[PDB]
Structure formats: structure tokens, C-alpha cells
């Protein structure tokens, strides 16, 4: 019951009234046997049912005279010896479980008391694991890290990560309970400069460079994520640039850098980067974590950094376009043979029907496997990335049963075959990548389809269908004869009046069997005035505004799916022809290190500066 | 604005503010707005009188203040997207029921006549209701809030009409009918509300038919 | 033409305007009981004795970073 009156007068903040209940306190020590008086009186400062000591009460309450609060703590504790125990002490529920008194001085931005907790000898690993600092979705709950370094990093406060930092106790390379060190930590929570500062970037290499090693990057989470990988699978473009062209311009520091200039004599500069981990040699590089991110949009604004654009064109140099090309011709004529050999059916040299066949076979398995590894059964993805992949399965098996209706069974076997072949002439538009011109013309009819041309056939359906109903039920009996002026007569053939008068064909005929022929022209007037008027102009002018808005932005939308069909393409051929076409070289980089690099000429005439740090004091290529 | 969200952060006056914080633990941070006064518990709210004032032009730029837009969210969340979707569900089986009785005209389960009939008596009740509250005297109101409750009174008219022509005195019954009918799917496209990509497209049809179709039509008649 | 670009800027608020308009008219249409079933927010402990029922709203700023005081609760999360 008195530790209440502790607690209240700790957290108002009255030192006089703390000086005497702790006095109180020690009599109470006094005046009693007990078992453990240091034990019986930690008991007294901690509240059991959530684990909250006194200490960790006045630091959540900041109550401008609480560090005089803390100091008369700590002597407390120490007079009666517990200061481990009680400094040390955490919360012990499912929500805050880990939760430390120098994770809530580290937190609350409190640059001293901090200070004096940590000469007070806490625990500078304190790994707050809780179901808080540990969420499950993104809003009630933080997750900075789980460590007061990734915590102090992670709220922006340089000056306790570098009170941290250089600490002989402090564990720079403390992998928490996600996998996560400090590094995956820190671009786990990097946004953009637009929500945050850059303050990220600069805690990153401010803590990697002084810690000083390829230790603390080379670990592995518990996904097998390197912290690039990392940056990669979840769209953080500002320190993946920040990272895949990192140079330290220090001779100690020089060797942990990703980007080195070889000569740079004068403007001109030859500056080569580490390909390491960002080329498809191994599993999970980097490009192909971005290429095949179908769950961020950050995508085509990530291949336009550096390595990764030199990477992409030196593969669509050397091997992918002319794989593309073959492709290609195999395709076309596989088409051309399925419409000879379906048009000039009866009522050597024709081997094409077997040729068809055994492409259609091709063509179906390839296309299955490549459905079951996109895993399509997420929203929007077979639109998103494999809708030419459905496609030309659809069409590969539509040929394949009108095979296997032809002869096996002896059916109507044309619905199949003529509709596989009007399909494939749409699939030699998807070979359109091949071109910047062609290929990102073919990039707004996928947008233009999705937004405009949908949502207008939907209202000109309504329209078609409410006036082609009225207007056929306006119509009395066929004719004295059956047929006679009974083109709006029925439901389908008023629909198809209709339809023809849209296209534009035909001739208006009026003089209809009617019963109200002013009614007949108000309904086919006002039909007129809301499709020819208002629907099909509107459509123009709409499709003039997507045009304008994604204008802006479909090279790199294009450059993105050229990009994935190099890379479908990289992991097709073998690995003596693979290893055939490697994009960098071996370079000695450092006194021992190795790294097969890859290079980038470019002139600069603004900076201006004394050249040091050069890989190569001689100029030139040689 | 300023009201809606209103803090004050000292100790004796913090009782007066509109917006409290509880736990901000990092950036991460819970906010709580006060509801007293702007939520449709009582009579003249501030949503009331913000949706309901045809007097006012920044209304559309009222509504995306704090509290405000997280309520009407809220509200189309719990109650008010499955009376949409179950109000479109008995329009859309009234016009159906209407056009399969008026073009299967002559020359069991065909209770669909007096079902129309039913309908057609409510729509034609409630929807005048509505115009009598709406008070549509002040000029472009009708075309401002009230268009769709005009033309869903028409519709349900229309029909009505038909019936007491029909069999009351037996004449021309085809003409109502049939404007009825067409109207009755025009009012389908007021159904597009609920959705953002082919609602938001239904307000751009109104915008070009008032500025751009009419005087074309206009200029195209005298020619 | 000129019509859709000046008035694609704000169909998203007139939009949301007029849902508004229909959220507003079925919301005073169900009864009393059903009404009730459906509440915005909960009943707060804001002052020494001050009941408000309260929304509540979460955000992330990552540019102020500013001391905690006025906190209604010292121990965060949901709980
Ligand atoms: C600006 C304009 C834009 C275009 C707007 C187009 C709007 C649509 C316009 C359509 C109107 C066209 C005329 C329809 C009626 C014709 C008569 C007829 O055949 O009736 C038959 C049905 O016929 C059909 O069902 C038609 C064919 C299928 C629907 C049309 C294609 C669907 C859209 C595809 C989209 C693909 C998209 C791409 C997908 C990858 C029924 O006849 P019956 O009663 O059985 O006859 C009995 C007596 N007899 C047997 C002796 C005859
Ligand atoms: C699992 C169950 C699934 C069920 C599905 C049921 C059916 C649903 C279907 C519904 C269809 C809905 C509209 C689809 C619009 C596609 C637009 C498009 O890609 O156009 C392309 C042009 O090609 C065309 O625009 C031609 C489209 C018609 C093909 C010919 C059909 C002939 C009749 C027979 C342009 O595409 P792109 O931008 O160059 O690249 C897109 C590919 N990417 C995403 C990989 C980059
Ligand atoms: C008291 C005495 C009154 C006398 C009146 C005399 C007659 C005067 C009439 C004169 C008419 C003048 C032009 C009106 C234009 C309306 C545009 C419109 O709303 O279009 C809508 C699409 O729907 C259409 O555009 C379809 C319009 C035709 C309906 C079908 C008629 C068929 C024949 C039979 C789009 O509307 P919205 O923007 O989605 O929402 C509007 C509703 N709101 C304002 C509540 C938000
Ligand atoms: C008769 C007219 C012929 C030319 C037509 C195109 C004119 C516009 C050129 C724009 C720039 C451009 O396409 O560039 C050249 C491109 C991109 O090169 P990039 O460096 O990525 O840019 O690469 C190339 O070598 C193109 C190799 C293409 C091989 C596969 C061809 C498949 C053809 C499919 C047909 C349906
Ligand atoms: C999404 C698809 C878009 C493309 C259009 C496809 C359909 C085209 C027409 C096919 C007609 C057909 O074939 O049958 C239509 C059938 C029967 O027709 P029938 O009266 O016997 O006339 C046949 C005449 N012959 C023999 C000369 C061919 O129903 C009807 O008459 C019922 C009409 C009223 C109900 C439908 C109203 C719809 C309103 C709008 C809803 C959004
Ligand atoms: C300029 C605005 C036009 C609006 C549309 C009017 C229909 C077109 C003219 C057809 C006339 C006709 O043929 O019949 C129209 C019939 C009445 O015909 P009636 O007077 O009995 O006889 C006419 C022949 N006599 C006089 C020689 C005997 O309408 C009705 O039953 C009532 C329809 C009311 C519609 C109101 C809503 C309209 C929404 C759009
Ligand atoms: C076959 C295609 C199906 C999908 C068609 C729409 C695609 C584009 C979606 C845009 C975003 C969107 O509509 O969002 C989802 C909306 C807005 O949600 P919000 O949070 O207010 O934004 O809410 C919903 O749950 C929608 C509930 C709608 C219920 C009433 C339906 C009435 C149908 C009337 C038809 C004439």
C-alpha cells in the first residue's frame, strides 16, 4: 500500500516527498526481520503485476525535475546494493515483454539520463521482443529493431548511437528475433524523402563505417536475405542506391566500398562497381528479386540505378536479342502453318500439320510450368505480369484439342482451330518488346484498355440493351405477310439496329409497322444523342487524359518487361554458353580482394578536385 | 478545420481541446478525435449540415477533414455498402420484372405484374417525400442533389399510370410503359455510385452533358 | 477535352460527396436498436471526469521528433 504513494509521488515529480517516503522505506528495512531485505525491497519498488519498477515509472513520466528523480533512485539502489537488479529489470506481459528503463530513456530522446544509465551499468543488449515492439500488421506497434542501438538509430538521434557505438560492452552484431541486425533493421523502416529525411542512410553508413568490416552486410536473415536483398524485396530505392554505389574515399575504409575509379584523369573518369551480389550468377540476386517483385510498384524506378542498367543493356547485347529475334521467327512461322493448314482444308511438304503439333505440345507444357511457378492467385497479377504467358496457353491448347476433336471423336473441330488462330495473331503483338518505339506504343494500349475502353463498354452496353429492349417492345404485330418493315421487330434484331446505327452502317429506316411513330423517333433520337454525342466523344477525351498521365512514365515500364524476358531468357541456355557471357572482369581491388566488377565511363566538368583514391595511377585502357 | 482537431497541450487547459493523444510511442502514434458534436447522433450534426447544404460550394472540400473522412469510411464499412448492394439488388429485379411483363406482352409465377405494381407505389411515395424535403424551388438544386430523386419519381409514376390506363379506361397504355422502361435502366447508371473507378466516371457524363453537349446541341439544331 | 482535364482534378471530392449523401440517407432510415448496433467510437477516460466517446486515428511522422508529454497513456499499444 505504500508503493502507491511511491509510484503517484515519482511520477508528479516531488523530490522532497520521494527523499522522505525512501526514508520511510529504509525504516521500514529497519523495523523488521523479513527473509531478504535488498530482495523484499526490490519487491516494494516494482509493481509484479506488469513489471514496471519506479525507475522505469519516472522516465515515462518526464516531469522537468526527474533526473535529480533518477539520481536519488540510483543512490537508493545502491545503498542498499540491488543496482543490478533493479536497473536491470524488465516487463514481464506478452505486450511490452523486453522492455528495459534504458530502452525508455533511449525512446523519450532524454540525451542524459541515458548516459547516466549506462555508467549506472545497464544492459546494453536488451532485446525488448514483446508482441509491441514486434507487430503483426503495421499501425499498434513499432518495430524498430529490437535492440537500444537499432532503437537510437531508428528515432533519428545520432548522438546516443555514437555514445553506443563506441562502447567495449555494446554488441554491434546482435541478430534479433526476426534474423534482423542492425542493418536489416534499419532498411526495414527507410522510407522515402518525401515522408522521412534521408537520416536513414546516413545512420547506415555511419554505423557500418564505424564498426568497420563485410561482417555485419553478409549476414543472413532469417529469410536468407542479405541487408541488400533485403532493400531489394521490399522496394527501398533510396538506400539501394545509396548502397549499390557506396565509395569510401578513405585508405583504412577503402576496402568495404562497392564503387572504384580506375584512371579519371582529367573530366573523363573510368569507375568500375562491384557486380557481386547483384548479377544473376547466384540464387536470389538482386536483379532478379526486382524483376520478379510482383508485390511492390517501385519496380521500374529501381533499374534505372546504375549497375543495374549497364547490367540489363550488356544482356540485351550480347544474347537476349537475338534470342528474342528466334524466337520470333519460330512463332510467326508456327502461326503462318497454323492458317495455311486450317484454310486450305480439303472440301509432300505438308509435314506443317505435324509442325503445328508438335509446337502446340511445346508451347502448352512451357507455358503451364511457367502459370504454376507466377502463382496467379493473387488480384491483378495475371494481369500484372503473365497475361501473355494465359495467353499463349490458351491458344497452344485450344490447337491441341481441336486435334483431339478432329479424329478422336469426329466433332465440329473449326470453333477451336479458327479461334487458336485469330488468337496467335494477337500474340505477335506481344512480340513488340523487341523495340523502344513499337513496344512502349504497345504499353498504352494496355492501359488505355484497362482504364477507358472498359468502363465506356460497360455504360454503352447499358444503353444498347435499355433502348433495343424499348424499342423492340414498341413494335406491334410482325406484318400482314410475317416480314415486313420489321427490322426493330424482335429484341436481337432491334439490338442489332441498333449496333449498326453506332458503326455507322446501314441506312435509318423510320417507316417502321409502329403504333406511335413520335414515340419511336424520341427513343432513337435520344439513343443517337447519348452514344454518337456524349459516349464516343467522351471517350476520346478521356483516353486524351490517360495518354497524357502515362506518357510520363511507360519507358520505364517497358524497359521493366524487356528486362523480365533477359531474364527468362539468362536462365534458359546452359552453362558452358552462360558462362560464354560473363559482364565484368576480376580486378585487383585491395591487397587481396577479388571482386569481378563491372565498369562505367563518365565525364563530369563541375567538381573539379584533386584526384585521389585512384585504382590505377596511369591512365587510359591498357 | 482548426476546431475539428484542436489540441491543448498544457496541463490546466487540456481539458478543452477536441483531439487527445494516448500513446505515441515512437513516430507510430494513436490520436483520438473527439465526436461529440460531428457525428449524426443527434439533431444538426456537422455531418448533416455539411452534406445537406445545398448553399454552399466547398462542401467536397469539407469532407476530407480528420474526423469527418474516417467516419463516413467507417460508415460505408459496417452498414451502408450492403443497403447499396441490397437496394441495387431490388431495383435491378423491378426493371427486369417490368420489361419481361411489357415486351411478353398477350397479342403461375406471373405475380410479377402486382410486384411492379407494389414497387412502383413505394418508389412513387418515398421518392415524392423526398422532393417535398429537398424543397427544389431554388433554381439548379434539381440538377444540384436532386436529379435522380426527380427521375426515380417520374419512372415510378409512369408506371403507375400505365396501370390506371390500362384497365380504367383502356387506351393507349404503350407510351408510358415504355418510357418507363427506358428510364428505368438509365436509373441504373445512378447505381454506379458505389464505386470509385465507375462513379467517379458518372461525374464527368454530367459535367460534359451541362457545359459541352448542351450548347452543341444548341448551335446544331439551328443549322 | 478541356472540360475532363479541368474537372478531373476534383471528381475524386465530388464523388465522395454524393456517396456521402446516399451513406447519410440509409443511415436515418433503420431503426433505433440497429442504429445503435452501429457506433463510430468508444467511451474515453479523457480528463479527471470527462466521458466524449471518441474516434481514434493512428499516424507515423518521422520529421518532428519531439519529448512525449500530454500522453493519455503511458504504456502503449492496444490494450
Ligand atoms: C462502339 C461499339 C463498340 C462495340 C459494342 C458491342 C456491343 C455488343 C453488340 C452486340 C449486338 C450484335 C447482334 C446481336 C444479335 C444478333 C442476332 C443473333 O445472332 O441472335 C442470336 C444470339 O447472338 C448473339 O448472342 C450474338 C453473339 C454473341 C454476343 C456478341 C459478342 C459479345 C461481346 C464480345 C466482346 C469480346 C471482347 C474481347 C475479348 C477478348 C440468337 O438467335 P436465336 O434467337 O437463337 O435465333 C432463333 C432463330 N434462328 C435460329 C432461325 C436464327
Ligand atoms: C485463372 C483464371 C483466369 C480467367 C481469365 C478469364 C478471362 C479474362 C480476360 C478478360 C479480358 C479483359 C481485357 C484484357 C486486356 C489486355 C490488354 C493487353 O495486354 O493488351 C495488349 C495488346 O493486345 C490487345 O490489346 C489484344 C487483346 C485481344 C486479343 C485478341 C482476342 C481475339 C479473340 C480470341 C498489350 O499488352 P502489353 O501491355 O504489351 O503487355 C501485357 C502483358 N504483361 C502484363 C505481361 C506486360
Ligand atoms: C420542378 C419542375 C422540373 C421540370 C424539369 C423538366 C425537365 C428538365 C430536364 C432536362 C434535361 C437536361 C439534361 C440533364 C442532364 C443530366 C446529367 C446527369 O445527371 O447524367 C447522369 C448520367 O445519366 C445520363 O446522362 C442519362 C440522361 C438521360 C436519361 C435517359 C432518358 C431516356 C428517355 C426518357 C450522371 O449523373 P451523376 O453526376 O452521376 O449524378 C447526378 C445526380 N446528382 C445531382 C444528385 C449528383
Ligand atoms: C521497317 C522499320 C524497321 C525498324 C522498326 C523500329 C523503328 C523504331 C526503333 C526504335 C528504337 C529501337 O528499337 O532500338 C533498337 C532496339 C532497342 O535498343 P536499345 O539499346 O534497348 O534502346 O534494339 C535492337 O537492336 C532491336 C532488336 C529486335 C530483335 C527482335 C525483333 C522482333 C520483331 C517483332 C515484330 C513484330
Ligand atoms: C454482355 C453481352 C453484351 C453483348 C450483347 C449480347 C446480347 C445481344 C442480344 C441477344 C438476344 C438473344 O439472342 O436473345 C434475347 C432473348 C430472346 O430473344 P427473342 O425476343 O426471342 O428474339 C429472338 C429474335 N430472333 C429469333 C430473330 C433471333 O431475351 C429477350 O428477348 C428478353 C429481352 C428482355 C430482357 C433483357 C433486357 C436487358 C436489359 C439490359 C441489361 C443490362
Ligand atoms: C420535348 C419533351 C418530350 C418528352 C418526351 C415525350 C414523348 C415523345 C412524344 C410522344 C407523343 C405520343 O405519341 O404520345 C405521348 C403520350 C400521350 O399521347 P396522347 O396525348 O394521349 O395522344 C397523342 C396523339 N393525339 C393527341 C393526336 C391523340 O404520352 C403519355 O402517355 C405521357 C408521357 C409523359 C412523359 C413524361 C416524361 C418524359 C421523360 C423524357
Ligand atoms: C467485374 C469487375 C468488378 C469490379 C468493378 C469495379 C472495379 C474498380 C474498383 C474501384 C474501387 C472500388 O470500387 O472500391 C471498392 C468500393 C469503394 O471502397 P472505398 O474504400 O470507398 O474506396 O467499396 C466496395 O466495397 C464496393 C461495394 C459496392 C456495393 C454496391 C454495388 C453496386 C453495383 C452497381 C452496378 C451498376
Redesign the pocket.
Known amino acids: 500500500r505504500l508503493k502507491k504513494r511511491i509510484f503517484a509521488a515519482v511520477s508528479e515529480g516531488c523530490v522532497e516527498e520521494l527523499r522522505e517516503l525512501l526514508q520511510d522505506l529504509q525504516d521500514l528495512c529497519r523495523r523488521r526481520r523479513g527473509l531478504d531485505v535488498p530482495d523484499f525491497l526490490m519487491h516494494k519498488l516494482t509493481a509484479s503485476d506488469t513489471g514496471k519498477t519506479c525507475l522505469m515509472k519516472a522516465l515515462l513520466n518526464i516531469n522537468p525535475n526527474t533526473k535529480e528523480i533518477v539520481r536519488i533512485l540510483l543512490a537508493f539502489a545502491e545503498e542498499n546494493d540491488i543496482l543490478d537488479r533493479f536497473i536491470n529489470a524488465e516487463y514481464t506481459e506478452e505486450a511490452y515483454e523486453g522492455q528495459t528503463a534504458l530502452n525508455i530513456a533511449i525512446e523519450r530522446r532524454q540525451g542524459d539520463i541515458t548516459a547516466v544509465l549506462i555508467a549506472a551499468g545497464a544492459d546494453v543488449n536488451a532485446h525488448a521482443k514483446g508482441v509491441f515492439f514486434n507487430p503483426k500488421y503495421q499501425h499498434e506497434g513499432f518495430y524498430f529493431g529490437e535492440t537500444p542501438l537499432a532503437l537510437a538509430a531508428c528515432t533519428n538521434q545520432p548522438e546516443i548511437v555514437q555514445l553506443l557505438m563506441e562502447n567495449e560492452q555494446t554488441d554491434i552484431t546482435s541478430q534479433d528475433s526476426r534474423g534482423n541486425n542492425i542493418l536489416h533493421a534499419l532498411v526495414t523502416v527507410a522510407e522515402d524523402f518525401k515522408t522521412q529525411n534521408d537520416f536513414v542512410k546516413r545512420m547506415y553508413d555511419m554505423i557500418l563505417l564505424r564498426s568497420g568490416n563485410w561482417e555485419l552486410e553478409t549476414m543472413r536473415n532469417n529469410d536468407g536475405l542479405t541487408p541488400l536483398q533485403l532493400a531489394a524485396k521490399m522496394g527501398k530505392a533510396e538506400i539501394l542506391k545509396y548502397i549499390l554505389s557506396r565509395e569510401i574515399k578513405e585508405k583504412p575504409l577503402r576496402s568495404l566500398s562497392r564503387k572504384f575509379t580506375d584512371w579519371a584523369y582529367g573530366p573523363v573518369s573510368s569507375s568500375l562497381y562491384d557486380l557481386t551480389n547483384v548479377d544473376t550468377t547466384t540464387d536470389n540476386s538482386v536483379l532478379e528479386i526486382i524483376v520478379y517483385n510482383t508485390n511492390i510498384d517501385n519496380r521500374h524506378e529501381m533499374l534505372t540505378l546504375e549497375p543495374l542498367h549497364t547490367l540489363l543493356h550488356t544482356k540485351w547485347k550480347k544474347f537476349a536479342k537475338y534470342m528474342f529475334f528466334l524466337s520470333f521467327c519460330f512463332y510467326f512461322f508456327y502461326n503462318i502453318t497454323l492458317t495455311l493448314v486450317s484454310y486450305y482444308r480439303p472440301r509432300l511438304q505438308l509435314l506443317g500439320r505435324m509442325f503445328v503439333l508438335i509446337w502446340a505440345t511445346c508451347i502448352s507444357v512451357k507455358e503451364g510450368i511457367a502459370i504454376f511457378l507466377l502463382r496467379p492467385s493473387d488480384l491483378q497479377s495475371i494481369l500484372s505480369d503473365a497475361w501473355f504467358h494465359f495467353v499463349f496457353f490458351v491458344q497452344a491448347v485450344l490447337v491441341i484439342l481441336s486435334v483431339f476433336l478432329y479424329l478422336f471423336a469426329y466433332k465440329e473441330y473449326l470453333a477451336c482451330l479458327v479461334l487458336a488462330m485469330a488468337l496467335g495473331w494477337a500474340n505477335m503483338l506481344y512480340y513488340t518488346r523487341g523495340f523502344q518505339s513499337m513496344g512502349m506504343y504497345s504499353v498504352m494500349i494496355q492501359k488505355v484498355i484497362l482504364h477507358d475502353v472498359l468502363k465506356f ?1 460497360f455504360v ?2 447499358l444503353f ?1 440493351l435499355g433502348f433495343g429492349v424499348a424499342l423492340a417492345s414498341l413494335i406491334e404485330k410482325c406484318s400482314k405477310d410475317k416480314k415486313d418493315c420489321s427490322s426493330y421487330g424482335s429484341f ?2 432491334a ?2 439496329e441498333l ?1 449498326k446505327l ?2 455507322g452502317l446501314g441506312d435509318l429506316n423510320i417507316q417502321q409497322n409502329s403504333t406511335y411513330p413520335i414515340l419511336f423517333l424520341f427513343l432513337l433520337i435520344t439513343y443517337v444523342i447519348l452514344t454518337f454525342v456524349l459516349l ?1 466523344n467522351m471517350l476520346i477525351a478521356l483516353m486524351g487524359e490517360t495518354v497524357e498521365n502515362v506518357s510520363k512514365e511507360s519507358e520505364r515500364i517497358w524497359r521493366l518487361q524487356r528486362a523480365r524476358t533477359i531474364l527468362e531468357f539468362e536462365k534458359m541456355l546452359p552453362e558452358w554458353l552462360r558462362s560464354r557471357f560473363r559482364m565484368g572482369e576480376l580486378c585487383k581491388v585491395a591487397d587481396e580482394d577479388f571482386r569481378l566488377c563491372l565498369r562505367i565511363n563518365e565525364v563530369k566538368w563541375t567538381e573539379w578536385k584533386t584526384h585521389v583514391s585512384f585504382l590505377n595511377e596511369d591512365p587510359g585502357p591498357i
Open positions: 463498354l454503352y452496353i444498347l436481337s434484331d439490338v442489332l449496333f453506332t458503326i464516343l
